[PDB]
Design a protein around this ligand. Structure first.
Ligand SMILES: CNc1ccccc1C(=O)O[C@H]1[C@@H](O)[C@H](n2cnc3c(=O)[nH]c(N)nc32)O[C@@H]1COP(=O)(O)OP(=O)(O)NP(=O)(O)O
Ligand SMILES: [Zn+2]
Lengths: 323, 123
RNA sequence: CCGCAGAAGAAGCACCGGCUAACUCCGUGCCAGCAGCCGCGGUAAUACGGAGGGUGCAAGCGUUAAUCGGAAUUACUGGGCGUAAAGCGCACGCAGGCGGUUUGUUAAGUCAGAUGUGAAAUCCCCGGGCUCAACCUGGGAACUGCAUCUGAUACUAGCAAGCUUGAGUCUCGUAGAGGGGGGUAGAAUUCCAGGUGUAGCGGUGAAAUGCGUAGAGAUCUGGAGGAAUACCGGUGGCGAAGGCGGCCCCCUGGACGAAGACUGACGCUCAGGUGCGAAAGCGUGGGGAGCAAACAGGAUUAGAUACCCUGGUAGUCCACGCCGUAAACGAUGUCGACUUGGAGGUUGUGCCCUUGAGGCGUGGCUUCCGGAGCUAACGCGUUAAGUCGACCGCCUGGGGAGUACGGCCGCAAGGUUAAAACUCAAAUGAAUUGACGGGGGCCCGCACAAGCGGUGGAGCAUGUGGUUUAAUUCGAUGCAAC
RNA sequence: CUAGUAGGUGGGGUAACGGCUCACCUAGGCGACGAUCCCUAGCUGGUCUGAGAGGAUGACCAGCCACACUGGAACUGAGACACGGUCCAGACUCCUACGGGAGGCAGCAGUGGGGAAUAUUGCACAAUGGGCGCAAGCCUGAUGCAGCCAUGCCGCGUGU
């Protein structure tokens, strides 16, 4: 890996794209004309790419590609013309600059963008067995930081009841109070599937939830053809296409939105609400904890700031230094 | 060690595992492709290869590398194997002769033209 | 064979990164491609493509396929299994393998001669003939066997006929967790009937189920029982191994020493065969203290069908039977004899003013250090992994796969035996150096610490980053940018 | 594990010893010194390799054996259980006046086909060899050659 050699190399790969696009036959013979595509499936060593034509091609990925991931739309080739026609045979000559995308946190292994070109990131979730706002709280900051739109969807609502929902919806009202988008539904039950469908209308976004939040239900509910197995018990990079438009990078991980450490002054910018809680405090450097005359504290224990949000926000900062 | 033992069991050396089994000391065999597959190289040693499962006559499929650079192979395409192995492509153990049968020589290599059996130039 | 033309009709292919003899220029830029191997190529590549130049090889060349050779890479010659693959847990013994010391003996083996036999062509020694060579031809040599004959008689063999140091035997002692069986007690604890007594107890880094005023916890007394048998006790002992620990009795095995007397090679090893097998589980039937898979609660966590807590079945102990695996380990086959030692361990004894605890010897074995020696190393090293011999087992790269299939066994698990395909190209060892630790220890400095004055709020200046601008010049930023 | 199995009597049969055979008798015989059962294989002198011993083999030439379309048969005969004889059943094959018949390329050459691949349906009785023959000689795809193959080997050369 060579930042320098990597650099000079970058320019080369870039030119290769524009140069190849200039026009074809000089390129030719083994492979066919270049075309655009996005990465639906990751074969570790291969990738399924959907072409402009709309037909997916499993392709090789020339070493010259530092990396690739799902949600990556860009130029591509298959082998020849003839070669795609017997058996999905294609190769990815180069990629495009991911306009909108996000990565996963990790521990040893470094942050890796999960998907690119995202208009909205709908946080799944599920009532079974029990939610944890924390997971959603940390996710809220991510959506703000990548400047992506967030949709929280309390799913599997059909599983709740009298003393079950009256505590679910309300408890989630927080999102409806601070201006967030949410739509209670139950894949098993197909309820509130109208609102979501419209929300996903003309947009490029995807859904990720925590361990077992009904991600397979919703993705399989909106549009499911010859493939409805991704439920079933409690268990587990392909970005599937939508029934009403939009795609959703599903890989068995993403739904488990962890939490990575970006900066120590950003955490305060995570929530817009803080725009009024970070005005005047007791200590110029008051981390908002046990200071005398704080602002965020005087608001929390005052009824305006949701206590639950305080504990979660404070825990997030203590989670980073966990390294 | 002992005699005793030796008289009972003979010593035993190895019997070599034949790297190929295009066999009956195959020199060459016609096969017919299957299709022209494609597979990745090896972890650091990376190159794409035009390779192809071959429907050999003795009955054993196996994918061969298609030598050189230049090409002319279809799915259905009688072909001629030789051994080999692309030491960087699993499953390769052969090598379909270039210039044989269903292909001629590639364009204009000059060096070692017998590999990639090519004519002599005009001189 | 004679002749005549005329340079005329006639050189190729591979290879040149390293191994492995041979180097440059371009193109290409982990792409296209290579290739036996290690590996090459992500902007000057001796390895890709092209070019040149050199190296080789020859009418022929390369490549592929093939066999061995290399490979001592199954190890007769000529390996290895303490830790790198390899000693079966462990034992016993029939086939078998191996054999103390004398003589006689046969002449079986051995040997030796000899008598034969061992097509020819290869081959070889030697020669000759085709212009050479290949080839061909002649001659010799050789073809290293079997057989027979005549001996040779050291050893091995068989028997015979002897011996004593092997072995075995009798005798006399020792020590010893050797076992098996049946007794029996204490320590402790579960549980109990109660005494006392009280809020809480119990549990935990914190907590909760649970028991807790129904009197827990705690205390005391008695009792019931279950399970296992401290201190001794050990670097200890005994045992074939696995292992075997309270005291007592009964039945029983082995080891060792000493005067000795006795026998007379009766021995060593051992495939198969036989029996025994740490813990799981099985029969069936008991039991059930403690502990504890399963299972159930409580907690932890992002989750925690985990670690922790209350616990709790199975199990555990008893029997019985069946099950047959152990890093069944000193990671060290058996039996034997040798070769340097020092301190040591536990048991025996002779002798010696034991006059003492004992001194000087003398046997057993086992610890720790250890020479030569041996060894890749580490290391080992008279208890050898040295030097040897004999026997027996095993190992033949990695995964594959201790699996499949067969087998056999088996209640079932399952054991056992044990492959293929393939795939990999190295795995593996140890030793060496550094780096490495939420390893440990050892130091100081304004590190802390001891104080001083600070900085931090507040108003103002540098700057800088955000943000903004037509431009807000360019670089410096985890302490080491401001 | 072996039944006509092991022997022993009897006979019978072969050119000849024998269970070879029939009949009779006995009840063995065999096995780790791997019987038998299975897989695969022409054998051998050699051949290649290796310092050797060994290892791998078994084309070409020579000794042996066995087979001649699938099978099962004897006969004939010096001699055969007989490639280019015989009969039967058999599979093909083929012909046919459908009644029946004909066919045997593990010869030689050629063909198909098979395959990675392996050559002419050539010539000769001159020599050597053989059959038959009283020689004469006839016959002889043995054989001598000739054709093809850079398949290997050798040499020569392609210029000094
Ligand atoms: O059981 C299945 C469902 O039947 C059930 N499930 C899904 N939707 C619903 C619903 O609406 N209601 C109920 N009761 N169950 C649901 O929830 C489970 C999860 O469904 P999954 O689709 O696999 O969820 P992810 O794809 O998000 N998971 P990962 O990110 O790891 O891929
Ligand atoms: Zn504050």
């Amino acid at each position: 890996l060579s930042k320098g050699q990597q650099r000079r190399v970058n320019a080369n790969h870039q030119r290769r794209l524009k140069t190849s696009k200039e026009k074809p036959d000089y390129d030719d013979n083994l492979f066919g004309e270049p075309d655009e595509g996005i990465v639906i499936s990751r074969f570790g060593m291969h990738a399924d790419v959907e072409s402009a034509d709309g037909d997916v091609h499993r392709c090789n990925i020339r070493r010259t590609i530092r990396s690739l991931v799902t949600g990556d739309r860009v130029v591509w080739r298959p082998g020849k013309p003839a070669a795609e026609g017997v058996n999905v045979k294609g190769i990815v000559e180069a990629v495009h600059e991911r306009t909108s995308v996000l990565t996963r946190p990790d521990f040893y292994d470094g942050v890796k963008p999960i998907a690119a070109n995202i208009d909205q990131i709908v946080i799944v979730s599920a009532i079974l067995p029990e939610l944890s706002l924390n997971i959603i709280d940390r996710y809220l900051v991510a959506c703000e930081t990548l400047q992506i739109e967030p949709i929280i969807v309390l799913n599997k609502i059909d599983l709740l009841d009298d003393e079950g929902m009256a505590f679910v919806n309300e408890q989630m009202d927080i999102y409806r109070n601070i201006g967030y988008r949410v739509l209670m539904v139950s894949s098993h039950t197909q309820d509130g599937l109208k609102p979501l469908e419209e929300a996903l209308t003309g947009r490029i976004s995807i859904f990720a939830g925590q361990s077992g939040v009904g991600k397979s239900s919703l993705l399989n509910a909106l549009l499911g053809l010859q493939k409805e197995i991704l439920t079933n018990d409690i268990s587990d990079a392909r970005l599937y296409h939508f029934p009403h438009g939009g795609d959703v990078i599903d890989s068995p991980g993403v739904r488990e939105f962890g939490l990575w450490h970006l900066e120590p002054e950003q955490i305060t910018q995570g929530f817009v609400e803080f725009h009024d809680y970070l005005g005047l405090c007791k200590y110029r450097d008051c981390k908002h904890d046990t200071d005398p005359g704080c602002a965020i504290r005087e608001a929390v224990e005052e009824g305006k700031i949701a206590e639950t949000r305080f504990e979660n926000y404070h825990r997030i900062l203590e989670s980073m230094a966990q390294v | 060690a002992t005699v005793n033992q030796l008289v009972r069991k003979p010593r035993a050396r190895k019997v070599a595992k034949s790297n190929v089994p295009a066999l009956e000391a195959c020199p060459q065999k016609r096969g017919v492709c299957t299709r022209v597959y494609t597979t990745t190289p090896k972890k650091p040693n990376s190159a794409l290869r035009k390779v192809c499962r071959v429907r050999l006559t003795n009955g054993f499929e196996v994918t061969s590398y298609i030598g050189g650079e230049g090409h002319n192979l279809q799915e259905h395409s009688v072909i001629l194997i030789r051994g080999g192995r692309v030491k960087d492509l699993p499953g390769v153990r052969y090598h379909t002769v270039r210039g044989a049968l269903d292909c001629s020589g590639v364009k204009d290599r000059k060096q070692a033209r017998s590999k990639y059996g090519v004519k002599r130039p005009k001189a």
